[PDB]
Amino acid sequence: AAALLDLVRRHAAEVLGHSGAESVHSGRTFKDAGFDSLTAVELRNRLAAATGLTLSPAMIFDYPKPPALADHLRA
Amino acid sequence: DAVVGHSQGEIAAACVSGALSLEDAAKVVALRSQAIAAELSGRGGMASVALGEDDVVSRLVDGVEVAAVNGPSSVVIAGDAHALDATLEILSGEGIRVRRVAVDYASHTRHVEDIRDTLAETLAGISAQAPAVPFYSTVTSEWVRDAGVLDGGYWYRNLRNQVRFGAAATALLEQGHTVFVEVSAHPVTVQPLSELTGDAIGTLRREDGGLRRLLASMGELFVRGIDVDWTAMVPAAGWV
């Protein structure tokens, strides 16, 4: 799921305008990076389009850790 | 297609539903606010919890009424100042996320019963018509289609009773309504709607009152397929 985590970090960085996947550490929580509800919804749209899976707009609060969200997306 | 309000926002709903007049709604809201200032001032506060009605009720101590049910995980309560203080200390011990609002009163509670007579004396029996815009209320959680229903007593009950906001939102979803645009200078309730359906847009933002924010708002509206009368913004020019 390393590719999944890398894609998640890159997509979140592009949502927030960050340089890339490295600029957002996987250990950092989603709220710590500066995400908000609308931005969280935008990342929800991005990830749902990327994987095609049905993703709720509220998963960010459930899995603030990017590795946790990536592992959930794995299943 | 439909208009929904929330507490004082419902007044604007009337003012735009076509059931009232602009002067009528303006006067009514002015008198309501004046009465609240004259009497309710310095008498309580609002506390919100990111939980449902069940969770909040299960540990609510005496002296607190549930103010509004914004959804399955968003419930706000209004009541006396120190009763709310005790409740928030209890939840702080419990660690459940909560918040307070810088308000000096409590709406949708028994305190509303103090000035019902004054509300009647201010003005009552306003000429409420059938709303041209299909208006779905939250006090009754049902569309109102008849003239004269939206009387001063109706506004008293609106100030008095609670809000089934989340249930109304789910009902509107079941009624085929998907696009939910919020008319507010700051995003106010887009988050619960996103948790419910994930498609809602705020109009403006705090400290972002410039034209660019407004243009971005109509842009996001247009992207989702809604037609926009762009040419009103920009006049004609030369040939390119």
Residue A41, chain B, CB below 8 Å: the answer is: yes
Yes or no, beta carbons of B198 and A57 under 8 Å apart: yes
Shortest Cα distance, chain A CAs vs residue B63, angstroms: 32
Whether B198 and A57 have beta carbons less than 8 Å apart is answered as: yes
Which tokens hold the place of A10? 């890159």
Amino acid making up residue B215: L
List Cβ neighbours of B79 (8 Å cut-off, separation of 6 or more). B44, B63, B64, B65, B106, B109
The amino acid at residue B3 is: V
Token pair in block for residue B28: 């009514």
Report yes or no: A57 at the B interface, CB cutoff 8 Å: yes
Nearest CA in chain A to B73: A58
- Specify the pairing of strand B135-136 against strand B143-144: antiparallel
Q: Using what technique was this structure determined?
A: cryo-EM
Structural resolution in Å: 4.0
Q: A2-16 and A37-51 are packed helices; what angle lies between their axes, rounded to 10 degrees?
A: 140
Residue of A nearest to B50 (CA): A61
Alpha carbon B47 to its chain centroid, in Å, reads 16
